[PDB]
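Quick one before lunch.
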Amino acid sequence: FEHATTVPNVPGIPYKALVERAGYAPLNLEITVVSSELTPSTNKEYVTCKFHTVVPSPQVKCCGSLECKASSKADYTCRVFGGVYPFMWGGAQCFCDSENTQLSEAYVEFAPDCTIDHAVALKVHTAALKVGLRIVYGNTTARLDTFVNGVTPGSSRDLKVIAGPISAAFSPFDHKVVIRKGLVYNYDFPEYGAMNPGAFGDIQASSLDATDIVARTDIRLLKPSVKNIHVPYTQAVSGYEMWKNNSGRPLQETAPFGCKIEVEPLRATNCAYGHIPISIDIPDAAFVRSSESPTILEVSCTVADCIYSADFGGSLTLQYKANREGHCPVHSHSTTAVLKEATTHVTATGSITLHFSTSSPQANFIVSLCGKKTTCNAECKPPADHIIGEPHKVDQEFQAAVSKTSWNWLLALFGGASSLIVVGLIVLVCSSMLINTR
Amino acid sequence: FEHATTVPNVPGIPYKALVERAGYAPLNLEITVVSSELTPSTNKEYVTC
Ligand SMILES: *[C@@H]1O[C@H](CO)[C@@H](O)[C@H](O)[C@H]1NC(C)=O
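Model of the 2-acetamido-2-deoxy-beta-D-glucopyranose complex:
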């Protein structure tokens, strides 16, 4: 049989339900969302890391001429200079009365440390959510893991179970992101082929070990200015360390709902938000006919004591009369309250307690023992402790915090002035006629 | 758990109380003031004889 139900997106929050079929005892169904797995689609754009300038041996043409030539190396620079003043420990490298000239050039390349200090700029889209569900029926536990989509049931025992789509779409990830040393940072990285000195991603490459590179970081050559042969180079500070210094806090400290983000899939997990509708198919053989089910008689409830606690602290008791030994389930069709155990033994005239929780102080509702129903009411008090991180609000508040006494007072407050005005008008018209008599 | 109660100053007078907690049986609490000890601060002034 197939049953439909909506569940909150949250871990460690079992949800209990029942299936009604004529001649079959209502079957307890427990559903647990073990964890969440939001995996988006992303594409590798480029990589960046601290670089190193190249300072190759300059070219010296003595007492003659020469011309500059470009080079395919990324961020390359070249420039000639006449009237050079070459000196070295060995002395004047060559000789002519200041006629000689020298060509200098430089370029950049990623340093060896980059191999492990690389930071990759990622473009992401189409967040996809994966949900793992564990379902208990007839004290039998089955499992499945399915994409949140409502069109691809998973495989578990060759059982087709579907979930979603989500009520709302949530994704902490933004279109542009960066990954560095296992830390993910939300930032609008410059597009590939865009070089801006003193900025993130100044050096860009298709792959870490790509021979072809493109970069621009405003390198300007300086004229020789000293005795010896030297190439003074002026360049802006590397942008990688710049972004490192003031990169801001990591996404791990900014993700809403406490998403637990992992890097190797670049995906979130254990993050709770939204609702999920699901349809569960259960084999008919799993069901049990009511003929063999225990029969109960003259059952009654009693709230020994309840507390309006965030955690599961509510208690209840039931007393029953029966004729057959065995087990029956227990349920509460009121969403405001949730039980703890789904089934229990049954005796001829036994009475058993129950643990439960509620989201309202007016503990009035209907609970079913085995197949039969029964009303049960009480009032609950706020707790002394008022800060706890354990599961809370298994059912969200439904403006039911208002008390029965509050309803009685509000009813006694509003007055029936409409009846007063109606009676006044009626007597007024009657008197008007009586005086039209004259 | 913490509970507040007022007791008379007197020996050999047990006082009984209960603590109410949801889902917990009320726990009997007996309190006895075995004795009193009023100790003041004093300073030696001098001696005579
Ligand atoms: C499940 O509950 C039924 C109901 O009494 C019982 O007969 C059966 O033995 C239970 N299964 C297990 C594995 O305990």
